[PDB]
Amino acid sequence: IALYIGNLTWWTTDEDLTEAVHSLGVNDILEIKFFENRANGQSKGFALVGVGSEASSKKLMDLLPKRELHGQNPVVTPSNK
């Protein structure tokens, strides 16, 4: 169950991401890969975050936009793949 998390500063880390997700009662994060400029390595400000349970997907969709990471509200968009 994949989710996209965007509106991140290019300095928002995976550790930054897992904390937020964790302090929301999600402990079934499977994968985090950011989208990056190939030439650069700079993050494009959005990431793919895999999650283990449908419940945990609901929590991120409803709750993650509420908390600011580096002064910004993440945007959550469920994957339709």
């Binding site: 990056e36 190939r38 700079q42």
Partner: protein, 196 residues
């Protein structure tokens, strides 16, 4: 500054030893091996040696060539906990080391650069991008100082070549981002061109 001794290409004897094949058969497989290895032991640590010679007052990097298009520095993976230098020595001995039983110590002094691999994928960068806490690979480059004369036993699947700086410079297409910027990273040293 820092003073390095260079010697003519023809001061060195090229030999052969038995072929040394990459651990993995496919691009796809090596990244799954990296994926699996990371999850047990974490970041892969690679070391590589920049061996410099000259012809005609101009520095040349020794490269290993596979096929037509593929080039690489002598080097390889560090075993977990292994010291960086001590393991590059090992890797040097195993790659180009002679087998006729002569002593051959490697003089490895300076670090000429660092490259990190953010994900399990081809791209590498001379810095850790700001969104990345745990790079998948850390590649460290060392300058290897050569003796006036030496014998390298080159594995038969490889072909040992001396690339002049001008061939490497601004040639990522040819050599990749690491090797093609060797000229720039070499530029700080003060080279003495002995004649033979």
């Amino acid at each position: 500054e820092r003073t390095i001794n260079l010697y003519p290409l023809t001061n060195y004897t090229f030999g052969t030893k038995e072929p040394l094949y990459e651990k993995d058969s496919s691009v796809a497989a090596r990244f799954q091996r990296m994926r699996e290895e990371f999850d047990k032991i974490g970041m892969r640590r690679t070391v590589e040696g920049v061996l410099i010679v000259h012809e005609h007052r101009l520095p040349h990097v020794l490269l290993l060539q596979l096929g037509t298009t593929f080039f690489k520095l002598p080097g390889g993976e560090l075993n977990p906990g292994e010291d960086e230098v001590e393991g590059l020595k090992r890797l040097m001995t195993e790659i180009l080391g002679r087998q006729d039983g002569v002593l051959q110590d490697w003089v490895i002094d300076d670090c000429i650069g660092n490259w990190w691999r953010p994900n399990f994928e081809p791209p590498q960068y001379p810095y850790i991008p700001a969104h990345i806490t745990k790079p998948k690979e850390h590649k460290k480059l060392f300058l290897v100082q050569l003796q006036e004369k030496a014998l390298f036993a080159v594995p038969k699947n490889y072909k040992l070549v001396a690339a002049p700086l001008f061939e490497l410079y601004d040639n990522a297409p040819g050599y990749g981002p690491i090797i093609s910027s060797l000229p720039q990273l070499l530029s700080r040293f003060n080279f003495i061109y002995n004649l033979e």
